Enzyme design. Structure first.
Site, short mmCIF file in Angstrom:
data_model
loop_
_atom_site.label_atom_id
_atom_site.label_comp_id
_atom_site.label_asym_id
_atom_site.label_seq_id
_atom_site.Cartn_x
_atom_site.Cartn_y
_atom_site.Cartn_z
N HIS A 137 41.51 31.04 33.01
CA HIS A 137 41.27 32.47 32.83
C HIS A 137 42.15 33.01 31.70
O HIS A 137 43.10 33.76 31.93
CB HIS A 137 41.46 33.25 34.14
CG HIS A 137 40.90 34.63 34.09
ND1 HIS A 137 40.35 35.25 35.18
CD2 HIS A 137 40.80 35.50 33.06
CE1 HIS A 137 39.92 36.45 34.83
NE2 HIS A 137 40.18 36.63 33.54
N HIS A 177 42.41 35.07 28.09
CA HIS A 177 41.87 35.93 27.04
C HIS A 177 42.59 35.58 25.74
O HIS A 177 43.82 35.65 25.67
CB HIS A 177 42.08 37.40 27.39
CG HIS A 177 41.35 37.84 28.61
ND1 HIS A 177 40.28 38.71 28.55
CD2 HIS A 177 41.51 37.55 29.93
CE1 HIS A 177 39.82 38.94 29.77
NE2 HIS A 177 40.54 38.24 30.63
N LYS A 205 31.05 33.53 30.80
CA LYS A 205 31.69 34.55 31.61
C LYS A 205 30.75 35.73 31.85
O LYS A 205 30.27 36.34 30.90
CB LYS A 205 32.95 35.07 30.93
CG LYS A 205 33.60 36.31 31.60
CD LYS A 205 34.19 36.00 32.99
CE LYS A 205 35.03 37.14 33.55
NZ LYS A 205 36.21 37.40 32.72
N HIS A 213 30.93 39.40 33.18
CA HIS A 213 31.96 40.42 33.34
C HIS A 213 31.32 41.79 33.49
O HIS A 213 30.44 42.15 32.70
CB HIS A 213 32.87 40.45 32.12
CG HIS A 213 34.16 41.16 32.36
ND1 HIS A 213 34.24 42.51 32.63
CD2 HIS A 213 35.43 40.69 32.39
CE1 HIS A 213 35.51 42.84 32.81
NE2 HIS A 213 36.25 41.75 32.67
N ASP A 249 32.24 44.61 32.58
CA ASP A 249 32.34 45.47 31.40
C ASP A 249 31.19 45.26 30.44
O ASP A 249 30.95 46.12 29.58
CB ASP A 249 33.68 45.29 30.69
CG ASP A 249 34.89 45.77 31.51
OD1 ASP A 249 34.74 46.12 32.70
OD2 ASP A 249 36.02 45.76 30.93
N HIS A 277 33.32 38.05 37.00
CA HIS A 277 34.02 39.26 37.38
C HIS A 277 32.90 40.25 37.71
O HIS A 277 32.16 40.67 36.81
CB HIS A 277 34.91 39.68 36.21
CG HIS A 277 35.48 41.07 36.29
ND1 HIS A 277 36.73 41.36 35.78
CD2 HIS A 277 34.96 42.24 36.73
CE1 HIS A 277 36.95 42.66 35.90
NE2 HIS A 277 35.90 43.21 36.49
N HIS A 326 39.71 36.05 39.89
CA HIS A 326 40.52 37.06 40.61
C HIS A 326 39.84 37.53 41.88
O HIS A 326 39.50 38.71 42.03
CB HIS A 326 40.94 38.24 39.71
CG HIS A 326 39.87 38.74 38.79
ND1 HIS A 326 38.69 39.29 39.24
CD2 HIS A 326 39.82 38.80 37.44
CE1 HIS A 326 37.95 39.64 38.20
NE2 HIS A 326 38.61 39.35 37.10
N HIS A 361 40.82 47.76 30.60
CA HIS A 361 39.40 48.06 30.67
C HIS A 361 39.00 49.28 29.85
O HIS A 361 37.85 49.74 29.95
CB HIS A 361 38.98 48.15 32.13
CG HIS A 361 39.12 46.85 32.85
ND1 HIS A 361 38.34 45.75 32.54
CD2 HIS A 361 39.98 46.44 33.81
CE1 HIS A 361 38.70 44.74 33.31
NE2 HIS A 361 39.69 45.13 34.09
N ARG A 364 40.32 49.39 43.06
CA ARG A 364 40.62 47.98 42.94
C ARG A 364 41.99 47.60 43.49
O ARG A 364 42.25 46.40 43.62
CB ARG A 364 40.51 47.55 41.47
CG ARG A 364 39.04 47.43 41.05
CD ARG A 364 38.82 47.40 39.56
NE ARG A 364 39.63 46.39 38.88
CZ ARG A 364 39.47 46.07 37.60
NH1 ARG A 364 38.50 46.65 36.90
NH2 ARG A 364 40.28 45.19 37.05
N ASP A 406 44.87 35.17 33.67
CA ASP A 406 44.31 36.41 33.12
C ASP A 406 45.12 36.90 31.93
O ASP A 406 45.23 38.11 31.71
CB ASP A 406 44.12 37.49 34.19
CG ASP A 406 42.85 38.31 34.00
OD1 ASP A 406 42.25 38.30 32.90
OD2 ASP A 406 42.46 39.00 35.00
F LIG Z 1 39.96 39.23 34.59
NI NI Z 2 38.24 40.07 35.23
NI NI Z 3 40.15 38.51 32.66
#
Ligand SMILES: [F-]
Ligand code: NI
Ligand code: NI
Ligand SMILES: [F-]
Ligand code: NI
Ligand code: NI
Lengths: 122, 570, 100, 570, 100, 100
Positions: free
Chosen positions: D137, D139, D220, D222, D224, D249, D275, D323, D339, D363
């Site tokens: 995980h 980024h 992935k 996600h 978002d 996610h 997560h 985010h 969350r 993460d």
């Molecule tokens: F994440």
């Molecule tokens: Ni995430």
């Molecule tokens: Ni992440």
């Protein structure tokens, strides 16, 4: 005289969003037991099955709220919201797979919604 | 449903008629137009608009009008306008300026700006976005100078040098085929665009021309190598054949001629006059008169920009070190002193404001500061607004005319002068995606993110061990565009047409993008955007007083500047 | 903080000066890099204080004297040069023969 | 001739039945078996055993059962056991675990572990040796994050991103063929193993699949980008065809569905739930129930690990930054607040201890700490021993069962989930020689030496000007495995089978070792070593209480952790 | 010492804070990076002292006031964020609007 | 100044020691890297002062005691090694078991 570096001096007036598009007010209820939050640009008929509203009134529409904001429904909460019309080509693909084409195909969208248990199809 | 303007600007950046202060200056830029459709603004994040089936299209493959990268809600400051738009990048180039998103559901989407599966997002709401700076007066002396330049928004370095050799410490020259080849290979590891100048000196054509064929992108005539009528003439003959630019630092000593003799040797051909005010070099005291001529593309270097109370006092020792001069030789000191004149420095401020000097540049490490070209451009504009008032051309109380005039000096005009504006120098469709994001409070001072060929190359970012990238220490750092082989695809080596035709990149194993220098010999002062004024500049040989249109040009030095002690730790 | 490359490097001049000042305070005659560090940091703090370039060109000759430094150090230092942000932007201070 | 155990362990490291404390925790590991022959231990140095004709064989060429590298006297901590052995490496891979030396004169030498002319020696006596950590995980936001990871024993980074673009700052996504190609080229300069995830979003197959063919190693999904039923479905259809893993996610907002709707879209297909507790993202409040299902491979990210008195207070602002949320939008704050739940964080500790959450991950830089996956794994295990007692499965007073369960979470299980355990993730013969040496006093805190493909890549080592390498300052530094072209041979770029078959490495000029992703779609929770428990996890929608087998799972937050202020300068 | 990358970087926050504190002590109004450095180092030393995240989120609003800094500096600093090793491991402190 | 690589690195030992000394002065029990930094800087300043290697090998055992440091820190530090320029050039100081 005091300088705030990088500050804005905005013009007068206000910004009208979604100008010229038909607006529709509808009542919507979260019949589920967890909160549901709905973004400004999701095709409204394709939201969570457990939101109860006249599903036909969500076809070809989305929330009439500023881009990037949302409406939040706590469990059991009923609220009135205002919708605006989708623009561009007025097509929706993906999301909940209820449309996958023109939003004009109301009968097909509602047939799919009813079969999958999206609440509020007449 | 309406949103007030303060809240709108907070959420999406400013829109039409809104103004923004540049850093801590008195300069205000006004949004002239906005490509959005209100209500359909693009934005990215949790529960935001750029999501599949919504503002992100889920149907089209990358080749079907989809972008590699969308910068959302940018306030563009460019010679072409000051305006609000999304910027779309694909294959490393700017392909669309307009409105991005999903035609399925949004009004007004520019047809080739679809956000799709292939699209990365950079949020530019609340940022000013400019083209990367084009510094055409770089001495390649210390590789640590590259990050200095990136941190102040410079993305192209044109100049010469081999490191801290005395020739390079004085002159923007990489001499001869072998040194040129070596520096082209060094350039493979420099995370910035580069073009290399050969030595514009000789009395036969072949020793000069072989540098062009070896890969040089232009020539430098410098008095420290003999800025004689012969060297001027042969260099321009080479440049006219090869379609490259010539820069000149003329004969300060007036040894072989006065300014009029240098102009006669130029004989109406195109030339880039470096540090035209003359502290950085040239015919004493009157070199700056070159900036009146139609065939001259005139630039300043940065230590005289703008005229301040400490400017004169720093210059003598700076000059002596740069040019390898000796304090115990009286004529060395007399030569240095002859170049340092408050009268011409003060007039240089005004000539910039009038559009008579068209370009800024650094002179990095050889009487110039690698990371202060952009900085000092805006300090000059601010000083001129304070001392001369808004320009007559302005309206609605904005400084947009002055802002266009000044941004052009370090973006489009150096690119035009060098023959590289087909690739770089402005935010326009079809050009390479070298873009600088600035927070308005840091505008012109410290860049937020520097994009090179569509990938971030440098950023002000925090603790790499932290849960998010914003915790301290926030500092300038090289990003993934500089790592591995990605440095090859995000940067351009600019070269002469002949070296490209002769296969120099393959011969040397160059992997960087290769840019062609062209259309250098058919331009003039008239082609300098917003800075196209030709006039008869008179400089009194006794008093150094500068006259234009019968009026003395003078202004006072300032004790304080913006973009200074509020920002810098040292 | 938005530190740029020069701000990061120049922190280590301040640090070397602090080190050298503690060595001087405990009675040591200073060496070449210690003396250069002290005079350099003095210049950069003077710019921060708002002194002029001309003031610092002269004050820099009165920061350390020959009895503060080891034999030969005065003659090793022909000049010290430093750039800092004055109220009117970055400027260069050159101090010739700072220790007689 | 007998040696007492204290002196034996001092000289050769511990042997059967001896215990070692992990850092400053309460956890003790016990040597389960020892491959040596007492009296024939290998050791290197002046007058020691590994000398020609003695413990080093002088006859055999490299191809004749001789090693490139022998790690002597290692205490291995791995899912396969906690035991004492020499480790032999050849061609960058672990070829033998057993007893090294010279068959001429020593008893019990493993036949392919000959120390010969070709053999380098690393002394592991008194060290714990583990596999390199597998962080699935990541980024890719700031290249400085690589050394942060290496310093805490991580050797593989799986994830996505293009640098500090908002898409990457929120999501482990390198979107589309061009960004993927650019980041594969950047990876050539990153001294760690890498695999890249594409955007798992779309409603047509081709925009998603073309990322796999371009070189992505997985996808992935996600929220978002829209974690909708359609994007979930299409991504899994792609993954089932391409044999790559999908990470999710999920839709925290419950916008298009609740957890049960996401599970219906998954439709029994394999997926890696990131997560899973949900602070880092997912269906509020009940996402963690995904960890009960047989087709889910569940991981935690690290800021909730373990539950401490400061955990809740740091999270709101962390989440808002990651985010791209706005403090002045009430629904943005409500989403963030939804969350962050002490009830599920506390239960997450227990679910790790029970083997219901199978994996840890960082993460990194998007609600997670790049250099704390290993660190926080052991802090969690220690907290659970303190609060729950030794596990019922333990014996002889050791914590070996808990140690195996927890080491598996950041070594073998992420490798299995990603389809890369044929290459990495454990100390086993036939796997790549990614090995981490730890002094027990620093175990899980700061790695001593990190071996990548059989060459040291990172080490805590001192003054490079000193007479020996131990004088201060001892700091983490890149070693020769990272320099020059050796970075190509010591690291793996993991890629899809289709991109490999289509020749992407040659197309892009990739020189790194190329690893194939495979066997991702035919696994489940049952394949997670020591962490294979399936059960019905009930999460009360009103109170957030977590129940398993009719029992509420809860524990207290702690005020202090080991592996913390005794060790860190900040 | 076994310094990791973050420990090395964060030394330069402490150093910048020491520099800024000496500038404040001699009477200067502090600039943007000076103010950020002081508040950041304050947070990281508070974690070392064993304060809670919640304590530091509030104390960080009372380290510098507007009369300690140059015009516009309060408005330039929307928040300061810092991570440090608390008794219970690394945590993030966010101070909103530290200087009114 | 003509700083070489080691001079640059060793500045950060001095800085870490200054940080640790300020933590000790406000009453904190020192951790592992803090204790190592203090003893290391002590050695390098002692060389600058002109002490012998043999003097520093013994003095280094009397800089910090167990009540100055956290539990377990004395046992974590088997030795501290540092090189510095003595009057007779660079030499190595090894202090065994500096904290009993
Ligand atoms: F994440
Ligand atoms: Ni995430
Ligand atoms: Ni992440
Ligand atoms: F120059
Ligand atoms: Ni010049
Ligand atoms: Ni020059």
């Amino acid at each position: 005289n005091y300088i705030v570096p990088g500050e804005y001096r905005v013009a007068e007036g206000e910004i009208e969003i979604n100008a010229g598009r038909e607006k529709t007010t509808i009542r919507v209820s979260n019949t589920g037991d967890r909160p549901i939050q709905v973004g400004s640009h999701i095709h409204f008929v394709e939201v969570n099955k457990e939101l109860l509203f006249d599903r036909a009134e969500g076809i070809g529409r989305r929330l009439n709220i500023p881009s990037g904001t949302a409406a939040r429904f706590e469990p059991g909460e009923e609220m009135e919201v205002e919708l605006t019309e989708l623009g561009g080509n007025r097509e929706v693909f993906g999301i909940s797979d209820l449309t996958n084409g023109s939003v004009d195909n109301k009968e097909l969208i509602l047939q799919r919604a009813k079969e999958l248990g999206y609440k509020g199809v007449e | 449903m309406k949103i007030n303007r303060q809240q709108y600007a907070e959420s999406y950046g400013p829109t039409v008629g809104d103004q923004v202060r540049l850093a801590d200056t008195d300069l205000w830029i006004e949004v002239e137009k906005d490509y959005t459709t209100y209500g359909d603004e693009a934005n990215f994040g949790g529960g935001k608009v750029l999501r599949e089936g919504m503002g992100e299209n889920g149907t089209y493959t990358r080749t079907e009008n989809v972008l590699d990268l969308l910068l959302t809600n940018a306030l563009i400051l460019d010679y072409t306008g000051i305006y609000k738009a999304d910027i779309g990048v694909k294959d490393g180039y700017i392909v669309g300026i307009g409105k991005g998103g999903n035609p399925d559901i949004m009004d007004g989407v520019t047809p080739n700006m679809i956000v799709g599966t292939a699209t990365e997002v950079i949020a530019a709401e609340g940022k000013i976005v400019t083209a990367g700076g084009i510094d055409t007066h770089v001495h390649f002396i210390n590789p640590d100078q590259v990050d200095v330049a990136l941190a102040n928004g410079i993305t192209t370095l044109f100049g010469g040098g081999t490191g801290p050799a005395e020739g390079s410490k004085a002159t923007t020259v990489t001499p001869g085929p072998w040194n040129i080849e070596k520096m082209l290979k060094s350039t493979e590891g420099l995370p910035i665009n580069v073009g290399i100048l050969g030595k514009g000196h000789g009395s036969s054509i072949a020793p000069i021309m072989e540098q062009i064929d070896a890969g040089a992108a232009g020539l430098k005539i410098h008095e420290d190598w003999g800025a004689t009528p012969a060297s001027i003439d042969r260099s321009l003959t080479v440049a006219d054949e090869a379609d490259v630019q010539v820069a000149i630092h003329s004969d300060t000593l007036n040894e072989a001629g006065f300014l009029e003799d240098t102009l006669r040797a130029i004989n109406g051909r195109v030339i880039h006059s470096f540090h035209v005010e003359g502290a950085g070099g040239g015919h004493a005291p009157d070199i700056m008169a070159m900036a009146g001529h139609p065939n001259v593309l005139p630039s300043s270097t940065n230590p005289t920009r703008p005229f301040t109370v400490n400017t004169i006092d720093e210059h003598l020792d700076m000059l002596m070190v740069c040019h390898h001069l000796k304090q115990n030789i009286p004529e060395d000191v007399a030569f240095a002193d002859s170049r340092i004149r408050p009268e011409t420095i003060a007039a240089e401020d005004i000539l910039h404001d009038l559009g008579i000097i068209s370009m800024m540049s650094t002179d990095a490490l050889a009487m110039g500061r690698a990371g202060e070209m952009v900085l000092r451009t805006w300090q000059t504009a601010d000083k001129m607004k304070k001392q001369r008032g808004p320009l007559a051309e302005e309206k609605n109380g904005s400084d947009n005319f002055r802002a266009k005039r000044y941004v052009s000096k370090y973006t489009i005009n150096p690119a035009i002068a060098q023959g590289i504006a087909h690739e770089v120098g402005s935010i326009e469709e079809g050009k390479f995606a070298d873009l600088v994001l600035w927070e308005p409070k840091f505008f012109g001072v410290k860049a937020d993110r520097v994009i090179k060929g569509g990938i971030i190359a440098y950023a002000q970012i925090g603790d790499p061990s932290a849960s998010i990238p914003t915790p301290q220490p926030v500092m300038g750092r090289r990003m993934y565009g500089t790592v591995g082989d990605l440095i090859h695809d995000t940067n351009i080596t600019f070269m002469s047409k002949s070296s490209i035709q002769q296969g120099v990149p393959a011969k040397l194993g160059l992997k960087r993008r290769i840019g062609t220098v062209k259309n250098c010999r058919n331009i003039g002062k008239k082609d300098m955007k917003w800075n196209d004024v030709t006039t008869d500049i008179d400089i009194n040989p006794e008093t150094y007083e500068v006259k234009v249109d019968g009026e003395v040009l003078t202004c006072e030095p300032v004790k304080e500047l913006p973009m200074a002690q509020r920002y810098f730790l040292f | 903080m938005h530190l740029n490359p020069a701000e990061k490097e120049k922190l280590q001049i301040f640090l070397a000066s602090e080190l050298a000042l503690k060595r001087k305070a405990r009675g040591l005659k200073l060496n070449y890099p210690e003396a250069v560090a002290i005079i350099t940091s003095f210049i950069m703090e003077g710019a921060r204080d708002g002194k002029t370039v001309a003031m610092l060109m002269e004050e820099g000759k009165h920061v350390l004297t020959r009895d503060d430094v080891m034999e030969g150090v005065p003659e090793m230092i022909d000049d010290i040069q430093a750039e800092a942000t004055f109220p009117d932007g970055t400027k260069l201070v050159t101090v010739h023969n700072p220790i007689s």
